[PDB]
Amino acid sequence: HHSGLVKMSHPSGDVEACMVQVTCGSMTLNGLWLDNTVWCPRHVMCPADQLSDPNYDALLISMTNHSFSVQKHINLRVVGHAMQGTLLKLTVDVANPSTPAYTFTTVKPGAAFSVLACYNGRPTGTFTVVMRPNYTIKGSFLCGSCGSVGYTKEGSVINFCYMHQMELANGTHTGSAFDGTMYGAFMDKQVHQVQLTDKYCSVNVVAWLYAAILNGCAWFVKPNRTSVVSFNEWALANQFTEFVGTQSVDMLAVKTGVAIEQLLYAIQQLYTGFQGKQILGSTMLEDEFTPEDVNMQI
Amino acid sequence: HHSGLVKMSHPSGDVEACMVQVTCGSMTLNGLWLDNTVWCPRHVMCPADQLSDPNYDALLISMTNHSFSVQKHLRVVGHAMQGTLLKLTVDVANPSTPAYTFTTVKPGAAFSVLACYNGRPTGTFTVVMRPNYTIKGSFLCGSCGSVGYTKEGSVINFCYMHQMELANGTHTGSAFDGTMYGAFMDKQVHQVQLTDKYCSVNVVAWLYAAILNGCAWFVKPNRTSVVSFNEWALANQFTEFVGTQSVDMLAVKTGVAIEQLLYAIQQLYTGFQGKQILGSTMLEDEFTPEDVNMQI
Ligand SMILES: *[C@H](O)[C@H](C[C@@H]1CCNC1=O)NC(=O)[C@H](CC(C)C)NC(=O)O[C@H]1CC[C@H](C(C)C)CC1
CATH class of the missing domain: 1.10.1840.10 (main proteinase (3clpro) structure, domain 3)
Structure with missing residues (x-):
């Protein structure tokens, strides 16, 4: 008997309307546009050559508001830039007219959430993943997917809980919560980092x-x-x-x-x-x- | 080494915007709202009493436009039957009608399903049309009218409207030309499923x-x-x-x-x-x- 127990995601329309593209120099990736704020991973500030030990505090200081292009596909004027942990908090001059009711809540191991995978600010696919006890997730992420976001929905309220940053050697992935912390305390540097041993939930x-x-x-x-x-x-x-x-x-x-x-x-x-x-x-x-x-x- | 090979669904936003609730007498399910047309399964016409062997041609004749209520979370001014589906005309046009087509998927092909209850999208998952013309997925009471689709560009190909569950827990529905996949009948009777095969x-x-x-x-x-x-x-x-x-x-x-x-x-x-x-x-x-x- 087919149980009907399958991998199910939340409908992604609410999050699709918030996805933008953020460009800084040569680097381009995805951002999340809520009210007058655009969130994106801060390594967008890093040029490919210096990605292996970036000085983020100095890169931020060296930026102006014009250093960031923000485009909606699915331009915006950046009028402030700030840094929160491993994320950039950009202020833009237009409030996203389709902002869902939302919260920022870190998820713990064993919890499931939906991921909207995006490339150049265009949603391409959605899947569900489970935060592992070693603070990694599986799923599918290719070059350009950083800034893809993971979320749950309870009621009208979306809970944003993940913003994609990196792939590890064993093929799994990790990213930030929206308080800026990296899950598992991985560093957003291009260096081999070995994940801890996993466990059954x-x-x-x-x-x-x-x-x-x-x-x-x-x-x-x-x-x-x-x-x-x-x-x-x-x-x-x-x-x-x-x-x-x-x-x-x-x-x-x-x-x-x-x-x-x-x-x-x-x-x-x-x-x-x-x-x-x-x-x-x-x-x-x-x-x-x-x-x-x-x-x-x- | 995790391959990165996972069950991936299409972003559902385009389709969420077309989902409505359809009511007829005391039955409700989901329908798909494209331009001035609302699509839904015809067994919304059937009293629960009579689901075993409904006379769909008599039920259609007994209806009026005012028999049908459409709510979008909409006034019906037309109604026709196409195969196992109803084609209702309403007075307001869906403004967010995506570019779309209607395709009949073949066995082995994958499509995305937007599972809905009472017109409200609740989940999305990917299924494969089996060689016996059934699908797995997750479908409970009230899920009928849920739609499956692929994408070729920004164009949506609507290929599936959910209809029923078989004895073994699998599922089947209609293509949008009104035919049931696998020629299953939209009546609540035991029906022989062919054995599955490897694609x-x-x-x-x-x-x-x-x-x-x-x-x-x-x-x-x-x-x-x-x-x-x-x-x-x-x-x-x-x-x-x-x-x-x-x-x-x-x-x-x-x-x-x-x-x-x-x-x-x-x-x-x-x-x-x-x-x-x-x-x-x-x-x-x-x-x-x-x-x-x-x-x-
Ligand atoms: C429409 O929402 C609904 C969905 C099914 C209900 C439960 N799961 C579903 O997928 N369809 C029907 O209710 C359908 C209507 C008929 C006119 C075709 N009836 C149906 O699917 O009946 C089946 C229910 C389960 C049983 C099993 C043996 C348990 C077989 C008949």
Whole structure:
């Protein structure tokens, strides 16, 4: 039986209307236009030759307002420039007439968000990703994608949580939150940086097993249980995040009647392999669906 | 090494702007608003009581324009039936009607779906039209009228309007000429689904992605021609392989020939024998040649 559990993004129209192109000298990439502000990664200020140890404090001082061209496709007059962590905060003289209600909230590991991939300020595609416990994401990003933004939507309010900066050697990616911090504390310098060891997102694995139960596949449920604190002590030493319950997990426990503690026991038995059986078409544990995904799609 | 090969959907903004809610009596679902026309599935005419064997020609005759309510989160002054779809004329024109066309997608092709409930877009995902003319995706009650589309430039090709769920949890709908994909009937009755098959051209594209990603252990100088593969495929639950410029592009990027990989499919179909290809132990057939060219 097809569960109907798929990678789903938010409709991207609200964010498409905010995408612009920012050019500084030779460098061009994407920016996010909210009210009278345009956000973009600050390495747009860096010339290709000096990208390996940029002095950003000095580059900013050396700029005027005319050093930045901002174009909307999907010109703007830059009337201020400032720097916030790894991002530029440009002020423009026209308020984006299609600004959505929004917030800036950093996301934590295990949370999913949508990404609108853009090239020269033109949206080209959207996909969903999960912030990993080593503060990376997968997805698809090519040359020119920097400034592509990731977001969620709760109600009318968009939460902007990601602005794309870089690719790492193992092919994964990272970027900034809109408070300017880089996720994982990576530096926006063109140098090899090795990511930390990854981990399974325990709360998402729980959601996925609940999804399996809701889809009729529950051979792996036994009466046996492992408490949250006991699972988390075992988690530190076998590459799993701490489990923290939510009202969203709790809805799934109520619907199925299978308790969290039974699925934490199940996880301890399953992470080695399924000894010949499948769960939701898979033979490994899946951890990129969230409790909220499962409540919405099943 | 993460390949960068992911399920990617088209930006949905153009289509979000066309979604409306359609109500008829006590039923509601989604419709697509292009110029002065609102498209929606005809079973919006059916009382829930009578979904098993509706008489669509009698239901249409019993309606008036004032039977239908259109709300855009709109006054109907016309109504006709085309195949399994309604074509409602309303008095206001959609000003944000994108340039568009109407195409019927073939098996193996990918399109984007904008899933909507009560006229409100809620999610977007990419599906592949299976060789049995079903799709996966995520569709709950109220999702009918959700539309699938591709893009060729700024032009939107509307290819799908969601209609129903089959016994096994898969889905199907109409093309915009009013035909159901796979000739399924828009009635709430058990219907026999043909067994699925492997889309060979997509399997080839996935193997090319692997080679570009530096995973080429399966690449031998052995070759199978298209016609031997096709003969083999008929008996082994695969589709006819048809070459394309998109595929040729990948054989030129990698220096590996289509026939080398056709040979490879015949071996890997038996299993990878302890090895992996892009984190998988089974062949993957839902990434197209176009996906791979564009994403790698
Ligand atoms: C329109 O919104 C709706 C969507 C389906 C509802 C649930 N999931 C959907 O995809 N379509 C219908 O309700 C459709 C109308 C008929 C006139 C064709 N009926 C339908 O899809 O019925 C099916 C529901 C599920 C069952 C399974 C055996 C469980 C089979 C019939």
